[PDB]
Design a protein around this ligand. Structure first.
Ligand code: GDP
Length: 267
């Protein structure tokens, strides 16, 4: 019954939840359902959320196991054609929801836009196998996914408290979920732990990789580290997976002559 469902997880968000919801309620040209999944805030959050138009607004307020648990509860209740997730410190830009509706009209399963972070565009990557040796290719809050996308991919993996968004998108890529990237800003707003989860997520695509080899690939694609061992890694594991060969030749087009050699002998 709704073009869009916006899932907003909140805990102690009294400072910004107003600005967040104003960015959703003011969206013109769409029927929007809002599901606020609050983890039991003791501050003004519940009152502020209640100060908005409640017509299509549901409030869940109960303990949960973290951000992605709250997101899962909201996604599970969503009735909209496309489902977005907005943090309480985030805002959608004007007209974004209508842009999502328009770009979804042919049945694409994911519609993703750009993200503005401290006045700079997030350095996004393409939605393609090459993302599988990296992080999430677009900002998770700039992503909208259909009911069928979530039905087919499933829910967010709570084992990942940082990078569950990346792991979900990688599962989408591996499931050949369709995606359309829109070159418009949709949303504005312990490294060792982040790196550990990101390596783990990459290894869930390619279980033959050592953690250090997942790290090398990740730093390689992101431009944080050198790439002279990429060909070595390709020769080491190319026989394991055509997807992995495809990912490396997409991420590092210069290894094409070596990639074709892997394809030719094993795939
Ligand atoms: N329901 C729920 N929401 C949370 C929890 N922790 C954080 N949040 C909310 O999740 C959103 C993002 O949290 P934040 O600390 O900014 O993490 P980040 O934006 O993903 O880096 C905000 O809307 C918070 O209110 C939690 O344990 N439960």
């Amino acid at each position: 019954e709704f073009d869009i469902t916006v899932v907003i997880p909140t805990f102690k968000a009294e400072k910004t939840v107003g600005q967040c919801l104003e960015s959703v309620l003011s969206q013109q040209g769409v029927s929007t359902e809002i599901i606020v999944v609050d983890g039991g805030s003791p501050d003004a959050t519940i009152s502020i959320v209640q100060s908005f138009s409640s017509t299509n607004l549901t409030i869940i307020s109960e303990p949960d196991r973290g951000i992605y648990d709250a997101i899962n509860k909201g996604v599970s209740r969503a009735q909209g054609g496309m489902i977005g997730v907005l943090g309480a410190d985030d805002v959608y830009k004007p007209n974004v929801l209508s842009v999502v509706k328009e770009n979804a009209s042919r049945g694409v399963e994911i519609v993703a836009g750009l993200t503005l972070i401290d006045g700079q565009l997030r350095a996004d990557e393409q939605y393609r196998p090459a993302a599988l040796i990296s992080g999430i290719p677009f900002g998770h809050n700039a992503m909208f996914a259909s009911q069928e996308a979530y039905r087919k991919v499933g829910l967010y993996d709570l084992a990942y408290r940082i990078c569950a968004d990346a792991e979900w998108v990688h599962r989408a890529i591996k499931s050949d979920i369709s995606c359309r990237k829109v070159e418009q800003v949709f949303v504005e707003f312990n490294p060792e732990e982040i790196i550990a989860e990101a390596c783990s997520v990459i290894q869930r695509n390619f279980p033959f990789l050592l953690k250090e080899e997942a790290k090398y690939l990740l730093y390689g694609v992101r431009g944080w580290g050198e790439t002279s061992r990429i060909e070595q890694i390709l020769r080491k594991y190319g026989h394991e997976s055509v997807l992995f060969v495809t990912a490396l030749q997409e991420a590092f087009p210069a290894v094409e002559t070596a990639a074709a050699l892997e394809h030719h002998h094993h795939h």
